[PDB]
Ligand SMILES: O=C(O)CNC(=O)C(=O)O
């Protein structure tokens with residue numbers, strides 16, 4: 044019942060198990076499986092409408108990209124610049140660079156580097172070819188500069204299916220598609236995003252651990268003005284139960300995605316994403332949409348995510364009103380001690 | 385230097401000390417004196433402009449009322465209804481009756497009773513004449529229904545002086561004049577008001593203990609939606625240092641006012657008001673003015689009182705946004721734990 048990602052699937056044509064238990068990292072909390080369903084299955088429509096995650100196995104969303112790999116993409120993607128994140132651990136914490144102004148004691152552990160696709164490939168290879176232990180993770184928004192064969196792939200994505208989704212759920216516009224290409228073992232630690240995400244897996248296998256927005260009190264996000272806004276403060280490999288006691292009560296939903304699977308990551312749901320150990324490189328492309336417009340009159344009882352939005356806005360307005368984000372904390376405490384705690 | 389109210393003053397004509405040390409209650413914190421100055425003294429103007437308290441000894445503000453007493457007021461004040469607060473302790477905690485909706489576990493210890501001036505006097509007297517231990521405190525806004533001799537007194541207040549003050553400080557309009565008539569030993573426990581107050585003493589002696597708005601963290605006001613909004617949770621006679629640890633650090637300003645003295649109580653300053661033990665009944669009339677309009681662009685550094693206003697507004701908006709004031713607390717805590725504390 045806490046079966047996490049379940050018994051690994053069998054590759055077609057008796058090519059054996061897709062992955063095994065030992066490619067997954069070990070964590071302190073339990074999880075139950077995300078459902079894997081066909082896009083024709085009305086349970087899947089039901090899950091998406093209710094803003095619960097579902098892995099869809101047959102959308103054909105990025106069918107033309109399943110041939111993508113490093114060689115094919117070097118050949119075809121253009122001479123635009125790609126953002127490449129760097130790290131000396133498997134954990135790639137990310138920084139909002141605009142917020143770094145306001146936190147001096149904030150030297151960064153994952154630096155961005157702009158480079159050309161060929162350079163990233165070279166750099167990956169002189170690491171492999173020399174056995175160094177650094178890690179890279181290309182994360183770049185698909186845009187104008189990409190070459191023609193890639194623009195044809197893109198155009199062959201299943202827009203008929205995803206636009207009907209966008210229409211049915213009343214979401215806003217497609218804000219972007221992020222192209223992600225990681226090394227085996229890379230982790231994107233637990234965070235939430237404020238848009239709806241269809242997360243289309245292309246090459247390799249990723250274990251995705253999701254927590255509902257109602258787990259906010261177990262995951263201890265950073266302050267909103269901090270550069271790690273929206274990321275959990277808890278180190279999942281070494282959790283500090285003294286600072287984060289409710290992380291002892293956290294319960295997640297997990298799954299392992301491979302080529303052709305699309306994971307719906309609903310807005311505000313926490314997600315922790317790991318490229319399987321010793322599984323080769325991973326490729327994914329996501330689809331971010333603004334969420335449906337927020338309705339005319341509030342309907343009680345509020346959803347968890349709207350309480351999350353409320354907290355964010357309190358922190359943001361208070362930061363503006365005090366003229367300094369560093370004063371948010373002291374004031375919030377003055378507000379609650381001996382009054383609300 | 386912590387001399388509190390100082391060596392008691394001598395009544396003119398060798399009528400002896402106005403009051404003595406033993407008419408004052410004993411409390412845990414230190415205090416320093418509020419200055420007593422003449423309204424001609426430019427230090428007093430300076431204090432008022434800077435929103436610091438000053439006792440003015442010679443304004444003649446309510447000179448025609450110094451003849452007021454129970455007999456004169458029964459004779460002359462009309463047949464309007466007077467609010468009379470009741471209590472079985474010296475401590476008169478007050479309730480905002482509109483806020484009682486939202487706190488069920490809120491039976492009240494000081495009930496209001498409407499009555500005619502003659503009834504209040506009778507009621508005082510059958511207590512005196514029978515030696516019961518209940519306490520009353522008439523607190524009523526001066527208005528239309530008062531009789532002609534009282535309206536003449538009123539008209540003879542020193543409007544020339546107080547309107548020039550109102551003009552010079554850019555305050556808004558006179559919102560009201562509260563008439564207060566207390567029994568000896570009555571206490572109004574520590575609270576703040578959001579208007580500027582000239583507090584004109586008429587009969588008897590009151591010890592006024594003020595704390596600056598920056599003592600908010602030592603005085604632990606009730607939640608804003610509570611019926612005791614703006615009052616301190618701390619019982620000054622039996623202070624709970626485990627719930628209110630910073631009450632151990634509180635420092636106040638004190639003074640003893642008598643007939644003819646006017647105490648400026650600046651907006652947001654905490655005040656605790658006690659009618660001296662065994663000093664007879666007290667009479668006071670206050671003058672409440674809306675504070676100056678809040679300036680176009682905020683000027684950093686903010687004043688303490690503006691941080692207080694900011695806290696109030698957070699509590700109020702959050703109560704509206706959640707649809708229930710009882711959820712304010714839980715959410716504020718969820719917001720700060722493991723994030724800002
Ligand atoms: O794929 C990853 O490692 C990170 N992806 C996301 O967090 C996302 O798509 O929102």
Ligand SMILES: O=C(O)CNC(=O)C(=O)O
Nearest residue numbers: 564572577581583657670
């Ligand atoms: O005089 C009292 O006992 C109470 N007065 C006040 O709190 C006031 O004038 O604001």
Ligand SMILES: [Fe+3]
Nearest residue numbers: 234235236314
């Ligand atoms: Fe994300």
Ligand SMILES: [Fe+3]
Nearest residue numbers: 575576577655
């Ligand atoms: Fe008051």
